[PDB]
């Protein structure tokens, strides 16, 4: 448990590769009102696993409506260039439709939220309680 909790600090991507690291980071992001970033990122990971075209087209539309559109209830913080590229990609959806937007959101979490996670009371409690 302590080796796993300490592994989350090795890099953001190592944190993301652990189910319990993802869950902890989610709880942390809720306290900072930025959990849409993680839920968008996870949605994109799931999208890339899709095996049928009808399923792919529907999920691309749902992800866009939920997270990417300017009126989206959980609109992610991405620039116009990134949002527009995504919009254009949605006309003929493929598995790389969200790559640009997902990369931007990954960078946003990695550089902003994740360093604060590693210094948080929440993470420090998890460490001290581990094992």
């Amino acid at each position: 448990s302590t080796e796993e909790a300490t592994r989350w600090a090795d890099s953001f991507d190592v944190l993301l590769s652990h189910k319990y690291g993802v869950a902890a980071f989610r709880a942390f992001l809720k306290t900072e009102f930025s959990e849409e970033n993680l839920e968008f990122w996870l949605a994109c990971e799931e999208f890339k696993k899709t095996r049928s075209t009808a399923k792919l087209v529907s999920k691309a539309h749902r992800i866009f409506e939920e997270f990417v559109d300017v009126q989206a209830p959980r609109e992610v913080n991405i620039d116009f260039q990134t949002r527009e590229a995504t919009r254009k990609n949605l006309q003929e959806p493929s598995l790389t439709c969200f790559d640009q937007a997902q990369g931007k959101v990954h960078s946003l979490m990695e550089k902003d939220s994740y360093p604060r996670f590693l210094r948080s009371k929440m993470y420090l409690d998890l460490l001290s309680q581990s094992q």
Binding site: F33, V70, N77, I78, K111
Partner: protein
């Protein structure tokens, strides 16, 4: 207790004011903390030169020398090479040749026509220093870094026997639906405005003037019933960048009716007037305005001291 909100549009200087509170009123930046910003300095540098190169297509600008074409290809391939915080001599040299190219510089001069970090030239002009294998970011290098804020971040610190509960937020349009969460029982707002925004467009809407956006947002905040009793402090920030820019880009871009001079004192004064005019309860409520350079510790310390005095005086 003082609940203090740092508000303003994207890139206005909010988190930089937050860095200054750590420097002045909390624990400061240790060398180890500085070292943690190295990969950010590198990323900001690499992303900035990439942005200028990319824009050269939109802008119909050629390289001063043909040999830079291969440097540009090399830059794009290498762009990931420094994510572990090592700028290779190869990458360093590629960037140096591109930044010194006359086409690249012509594009840099026209950066209002695209999206470029304010600290781009700061870092690019210091490439020799920052590219050394032993490089440790200085405190000013840290202050100059660009990391976009998402969500709402609370910190605390003490000053003049007051306990400050400080809230830093994201400034982009997408973020602003979250701000209401922190609007209860607010003692003071520092509302940041990038003076140097007057000729830029929003990263999230490239057909919106950034200062016009800031005005709309200040209108909204200043007159919000949540803040009737809140001390409203206006930081007309990036005064240093504004001083330089005003000598080459006319204020009429933002305010077509302006008939004053394109000088720091007159143009700055006019912007102050435009923001202060948005107060629809002038008989009832003050705006406490300061011209700031958020990256200048001495300046922010002086201004924040003055601000604290206003808050004490307003809570007697």
């Amino acid at each position: 207790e003082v609940k203090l909100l740092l508000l303003g549009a994207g890139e206005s200087g909010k988190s930089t004011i937050v860095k200054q509170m750590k420097i002045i009123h909390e624990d400061g930046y240790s060398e180890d903390e500085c070292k943690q910003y190295k990969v950010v300095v590198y990323s900001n540098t690499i992303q900035s030169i990439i942005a200028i190169i990319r824009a050269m297509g939109r802008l119909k600008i050629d390289f001063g020398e043909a040999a830079r074409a291969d440097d540009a290809r090399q830059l794009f391939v290498l762009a990931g090479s420094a994510e572990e915080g090592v700028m290779t001599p190869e990458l360093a040299g590629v960037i140096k040749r591109l930044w010194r190219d006359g086409g690249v510089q012509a594009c840099f001069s026209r950066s209002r026509e695209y999206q470029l970090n304010d600290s781009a030239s700061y870092y690019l002009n210091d490439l020799d220093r920052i590219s050394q294998s032993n490089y440790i970011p200085t405190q000013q290098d840290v202050l100059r870094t660009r990391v976009k804020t998402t969500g709402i971040v609370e910190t605390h610190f003490t000053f003049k026997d007051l306990y400050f509960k400080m809230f830093d937020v994201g400034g982009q349009r997408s973020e602003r639906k979250k701000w209401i969460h922190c609007f209860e029982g607010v003692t003071a707002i520092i509302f940041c405005v990038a003076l140097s925004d007057y000729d830029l467009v929003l990263a999230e809407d490239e057909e919106m003037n950034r200062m016009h956006e800031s005005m709309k947002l200040f209108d909204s905040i200043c007159n919000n019933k949540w803040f009737t009793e809140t001390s409203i402090i206006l930081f007309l920030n990036k005064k240093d960048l504004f001083e330089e820019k005003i000598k080459r880009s006319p204020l009429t871009i933002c305010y077509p009716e302006y008939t004053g001079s394109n000088t720091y004192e007159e143009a700055a004064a006019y912007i102050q007037c435009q923001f202060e005019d948005l107060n629809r309860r002038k008989d009832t409520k003050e705006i406490y305005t300061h011209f700031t350079c958020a990256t200048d510790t001495k300046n922010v310390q002086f201004v924040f001291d003055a601000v604290t005095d206003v808050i004490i005086k307003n809570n007697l």
